[PDB]
Amino acid sequence: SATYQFDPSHTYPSFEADHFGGLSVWRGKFDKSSGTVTLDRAAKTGTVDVTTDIASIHTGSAKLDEHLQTAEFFDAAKFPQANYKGTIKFDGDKPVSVVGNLTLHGVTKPLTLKIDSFKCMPHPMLKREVCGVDAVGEFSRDDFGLDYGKQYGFKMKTKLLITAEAVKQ
Amino acid sequence: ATYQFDPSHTYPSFEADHFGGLSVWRGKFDKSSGTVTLDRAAKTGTVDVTTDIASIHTGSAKLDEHLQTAEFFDAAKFPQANYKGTIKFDGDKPVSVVGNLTLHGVTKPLTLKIDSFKCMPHPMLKREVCGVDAVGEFSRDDFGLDYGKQYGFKMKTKLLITAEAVKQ
Ligand SMILES: CC(C)=CCC/C(C)=C/CC/C(C)=C/CC/C(C)=C/CC/C(C)=C/CC/C(C)=C/CC/C(C)=C/CC/C(C)=C/COP(=O)(O)OP(=O)(O)O
Ligand SMILES: CC(C)=CCC/C(C)=C/CC/C(C)=C/CC/C(C)=C/CC/C(C)=C/CC/C(C)=C/CC/C(C)=C/CC/C(C)=C/COP(=O)(O)OP(=O)(O)O
């Protein structure tokens, strides 16, 4: 069993969201995350606790970024952070998913992240073990009270593409 | 027909390796512009697009600035990347763009696969808008961008392209 702290400079949730009913895909990410992983490879368990600052969104449009902070969408004044906690599941000898709960826009809903890749190595600078993952999830944003655009043909399905690296304490 | 890219819905996003599979860097370039031609009867069309290197966003300001330097893109020398290509149709629908990318002053062949294509009247502008999601992949060392190669970094770089163009 081991405890690791996410390296913010290599931990980001990226997303994909719909524009105009399939016209194109909005892609972007949140720049500021932090948290902790625990992993016990021999017991085939582990956990994640991660927090993302909503104000750190980047869409490519500074105007959209600022607009999404308002009460029409994230209401970042009331809910500055999103938080995910979950239990790591293994399939064979490697982690394969995290089953847990996301709190976004003040609302808590189930969310499972599938782990597409997992690697551990000695960190080229800090020396201690660093574990890294690529993971994916999807949710319907209206389940978190985020239904803007629904009345105009926008699809609520939101994809998450997660980069994370965590360094053993 | 001729269409101008709407910069606010046109972005090349990317995926790149970190430490030989440790994780995936994701980001995008925020500023692009250009033009599409489409003759859907004749089943042909073209793309001409330019992206500003200084518009890169990776989530890490330190990395964004390091990428500008002569160690990587050398934006003082080469501020823009430019892609031109010919649209191919798989019948009625565009399916790919076959062309050339100029990146870091080097021109190489690059094919973009079109995963989705839709045209519709634009809500606000009241002219036709066409939109695509497209993908491509290249090896960055083919453009002289080999940083990290000595240290196990993979050179395969994926492009995930969002584009919307409004009919003139
Ligand atoms: C071993 C190890 C490393 C283990 C770890 C394992 C692991 C999997 C760890 C998890 C790590 C991490 C980082 C997890 C992240 C978890 C978190 C907190 C996730 C939540 C992320 C989050 C905040 C998601 C929100 C996503 C959303 C809803 C984004 C916004 C999408 C968006 C752009 C919607 C469109 C809105 C609008 C208004 C569009 C219209 O455009 P507009 O320009 O106005 O004009 P037009 O009129 O043309 O439409
Ligand atoms: C009808 C219609 C709409 C038709 C249109 C069809 C169509 C397909 C149109 C195309 C539209 C568009 C927008 C096309 C775009 C084409 C263009 C010009 C594409 C080029 C984009 C471009 C500039 C690509 C470059 C991508 C690259 C190489 C990005 C950087 C990758 C990167 C971050 C690599 C990592 C490098 C390093 C050094 C990482 C290590 O640093 P770090 O992790 O901080 O370090 P350490 O751990 O030590 O701290």
Residue numbers in the entry:
A (entry chain B): 6 to 174
B (entry chain A): 7 to 174
What does the paper say about this structure?
In this study, we discovered that secreted BCNs contribute to antibiotic resistance by capturing and neutralizing antibiotics in the bacterial milieu. Visual inspection and structural alignments by the DALI server confirmed a barrel-shaped lipocalin fold for both proteins. An octaprenyl pyrophosphate was bound within a long, hydrophobic tunnel extending from one end of the barrel in each structure.
Analysis with the PDBePISA server predicted that BcnA is a monomer, while BcnB is a dimer, by crystallographic symmetry (~2,840 Å2 of buried surface area including a portion of the tunnel opening). These oligomeric states were confirmed in solution by size exclusion chromatography-multiangle light scattering (SEC-MALS). Superposition of BcnA chain A and BcnB chain C (148 Cα atoms, 22% sequence identity) resulted in a root mean square deviation (RMSD) of 1.66 Å. These differences may play a role in the antibiotic binding potential of BcnA and BcnB. Notably, the binding of BcnB to Nile red occurred with ~20-fold lower affinity than that of BcnA, agreeing with the lesser role of BcnB in antibiotic resistance. The secretion of the BcnA and BcnB proteins was also investigated by using FLAG-tagged derivatives; only BcnA was secreted extracellularly into the growth medium.
